Amino acid sequence: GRTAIIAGNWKMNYGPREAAKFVQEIQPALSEALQAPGSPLCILCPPAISLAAVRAVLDIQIELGAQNMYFEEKGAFTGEISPNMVHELCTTVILGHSERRTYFGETDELVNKKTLAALRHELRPIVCIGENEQQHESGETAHIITTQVRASLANLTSEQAREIVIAYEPIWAIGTGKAATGEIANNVIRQIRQEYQAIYGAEAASVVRILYGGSVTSDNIAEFMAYPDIDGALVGGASLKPDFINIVRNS
């Protein structure tokens, strides 16, 4: 009984002009696809500099999300944007993406601070967790998942524990064109739900949305969505293409 979510992470692609053109291309068909019963919630996550341009196209329902923010209300953090700023244009924010954990040193602790800040500003956080190739090959997947859930998804109230979205993204599946099999994704996503249950209780774990990310296309989205525990997808490179519409159709 969980509403499914298809979220498009554009990453660092499409500046203001290109972002507006892309949404002008996909919006008529995407909006019509989302009118069908059982359609997912659909969120576009452009670069922050391009949010206003996309907002202007959409305002002439597809929701808008940011790819990152900082956790303080305001202040002396050159280069950062605040939850208040994001909320002016967006319903949603991606947090803890593996690219930010690896290239920019983001920790579980920092991700949790951003997660609480999102929730306390009426933003939907999509919190990314996942193991890398070496951890997966050495059998450490379960331990990594447990550690990341307990730290990144800490401190939630019962009501908030219902509002967050978790995205499982095997780092070995990102941009490689090698998605996890549905069986592997389901196995780990059920572990995430179990760990969530351990902290927050059975009811909260039954309402939290958990997505799969990592080389999702319209060709394999149905393979993941067939599992009851998989509630949607965080889409990477395909979110830059019209195939994003067909992911929504096939979800």
- Residues known to be catalytic: 97, 169
Task: Tell whether 10 is in a known binding site.
Answer: yes
Which of 12-20, 36-44, 183-191, 195-203 is the region at the interface with a copy of itself (rule: CB under 8 A)?
Answer: 12-20
| Interaction between residue 66 and a copy of itself (CB under 8 A) | yes
Which of 27-35, 69-77, 136-144, 184-192 is the region at the interface with a copy of itself (rule: CB under 8 A)?
Answer: 69-77
Which ranges of 132-211 does DSSP label H, i.e. alpha helix? 133-137, 141-152, 158-161, 182-200, 202-207
| Interaction between residue 131 and a copy of itself (CB under 8 A) | no
Of the candidate residues 3, 32, 77, 120, the single one contacting a copy of itself (CB under 8 A): 77
* CA atoms lying within 13 Å on the CB side of residue 22: 26
- d(C-alpha 4, C-alpha 199), whole Å: 23
Which of 98-106, 179-187, 203-211, 216-224 is the region at the interface with a copy of itself (rule: CB under 8 A)?
Answer: 98-106
Question: What is the token pair recorded at 11?
Answer: 């990453």
- d(C-alpha 73, C-alpha 94), whole Å: 17
Of the candidate residues 16, 162, 182, 187, the single one contacting a copy of itself (CB under 8 A): 16
- Under 8 Å between Cβ of 152 and 127: yes
- d(C-alpha 218, C-alpha 243), whole Å: 6
| Interaction between residue 173 and a copy of itself (CB under 8 A) | no
Measured from the CB atom, the residue of 171 and 205 that comes closer to a copy of itself is: 171
| Interaction between residue 21 and a copy of itself (CB under 8 A) | no
- d(C-alpha 36, C-alpha 154), whole Å: 36
162-179 in b/e burial notation, b at 16+ Cβ within 10 A?
bbbbbbbbbbbbbeeeeb
- d(C-alpha 144, C-alpha 156), whole Å: 20
Of the candidate residues 4, 5, 7, 11, the single one contacting a copy of itself (CB under 8 A): 11
| Interaction between residue 177 and a copy of itself (CB under 8 A) | no
Task: Report the interface residues with a copy of itself, using CB under 8 A.
Answer: 9, 11-13, 15-17, 47-53, 66-68, 70, 72, 74-82, 84-86, 88-89, 94, 97, 99-100, 103-105, 174-175, 236-237
